Design an enzyme around this catalytic site. Sequence first.
Site, short mmCIF file in Angstrom:
data_model
loop_
_atom_site.label_atom_id
_atom_site.label_comp_id
_atom_site.label_asym_id
_atom_site.label_seq_id
_atom_site.Cartn_x
_atom_site.Cartn_y
_atom_site.Cartn_z
N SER A 97 0.84 -1.20 0.00
CA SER A 97 0.00 0.00 0.00
C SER A 97 0.88 1.26 0.00
O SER A 97 1.50 1.59 -1.01
CB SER A 97 -0.96 -0.01 1.21
OG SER A 97 -1.91 1.05 1.19
N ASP A 237 -2.39 6.40 -3.39
CA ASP A 237 -1.33 5.61 -2.77
C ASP A 237 -0.93 4.51 -3.76
O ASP A 237 -1.47 4.41 -4.87
CB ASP A 237 -1.73 5.00 -1.43
CG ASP A 237 -2.93 4.07 -1.53
OD1 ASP A 237 -3.58 3.92 -2.60
OD2 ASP A 237 -3.19 3.42 -0.51
N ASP A 239 -1.14 1.19 -4.21
CA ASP A 239 -2.07 0.20 -4.75
C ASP A 239 -3.39 0.84 -5.20
O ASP A 239 -4.34 0.13 -5.55
CB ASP A 239 -2.32 -0.95 -3.74
CG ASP A 239 -3.03 -0.50 -2.48
OD1 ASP A 239 -2.85 0.66 -2.07
OD2 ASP A 239 -3.77 -1.32 -1.86
N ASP A 241 -6.07 2.14 -3.95
CA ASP A 241 -7.43 2.08 -3.42
C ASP A 241 -7.81 3.34 -2.67
O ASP A 241 -8.97 3.46 -2.27
CB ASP A 241 -7.66 0.84 -2.51
CG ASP A 241 -6.66 0.74 -1.40
OD1 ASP A 241 -5.77 1.61 -1.32
OD2 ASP A 241 -6.65 -0.30 -0.69
#
EC number: 5.4.2.2
Length: 448
Positions: A97, A237, A239, A241
């Site tokens: 992340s 960020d 990843d 999400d």
Amino acid sequence: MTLPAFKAYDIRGRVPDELNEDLARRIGVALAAQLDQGPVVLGHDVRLASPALQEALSAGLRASGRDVIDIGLCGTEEVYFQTDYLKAAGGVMVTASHNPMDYNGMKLVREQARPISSDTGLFAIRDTVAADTAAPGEPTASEQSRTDKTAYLEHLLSYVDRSTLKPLKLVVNAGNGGAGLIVDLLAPHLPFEFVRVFHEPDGNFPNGIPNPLLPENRDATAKAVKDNGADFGIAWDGDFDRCFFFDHTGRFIEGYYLVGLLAQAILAKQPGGKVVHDPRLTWNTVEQVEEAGGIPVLCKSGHAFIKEKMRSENAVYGGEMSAHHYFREFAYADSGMIPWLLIAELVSQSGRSLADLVEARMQKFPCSGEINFKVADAKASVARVMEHYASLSPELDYTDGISADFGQWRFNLRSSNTEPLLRLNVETRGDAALLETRTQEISNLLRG
Ligand SMILES: [Ca+2]
């Protein structure tokens, strides 16, 4: 006495001390026993160790007779989307992340991208893994590569009316994470002019870790917006999400106000729907949802709680002030791509800038932002606050920490379970002076 990598909602640890290929392979074996039958979707982010960890996970899964669908380099939401779309038994995203370079981890879902949490199987996996001394078997199942993002891209585009879009100029900052790959695949289908900052996926992170809350990553996006006269800017960020917004003046927009904006954007398409939100900051969301003819639904914060509450309520949309946005039509899962498509459509259709859309809400409901306090004794600190304000007779609610409503202002105070850490959120009804005094007043009581 327990594997530290296993947290409440996901697996997170430093490589290779807390998380490594052997643990990854054992997680694959253990996961195969917790799922219903069917194949397992695997994806991974740009971090250097992520391919290896995903390979180990595939090995353990296929040794246990599970077919694996490898979707390759992706964002977390693509694992959610494909798991649901391919009617798979489950899905694993390998991702760190927004964490430092020496970290990695996994997010696990079962059928329909339902979360695997400590309450719902994650600790059963942990226990199985911690007890598995057996030798690695051999794969008795296939790994199919399925890198085609077409169904996911078509799904994203279905949220907006492309004939209503204007050719806005948008700054996009992937932070050398994965989001730039999606932007470039959407761009042929959109009228927008993109200005790409830190665009190429690069697990060495030469421009810093992809965390848009870090002031230097914040300033790089704000500068690009101002220097290029963009209509707004978007940062993700690693990843992707989570999605963060900058208006045309370069101002970072506090995520709280996006919940109400997205709600009214969605309720315009699906009138009368329910909107789930968390208790930290609430008054703006309640008002905007009700003004748009919706019904707001309070829920505990945290993605596992919001997703299950949305399922149970058939909620069209749920949002957290911490830049997590969930949509029923997206398998009740979070996306960092849908929010900015909806915002670009709202700006295009309304002829209002993002700045004007939010400035009205900021003036009505000023908020402190989330403030963290490391304290010696969480219970004593909280008690000191409650005792000090008890004579004002606030309305109390314990959905998620303590929420105290005083009429003209309110606060929410949550304690971490892993450590003595207090998180404070304050807001007022149109009173910035009151906001700052109460925030400092509480800050003093919490500290001393
Ligand atoms: Ca993320």
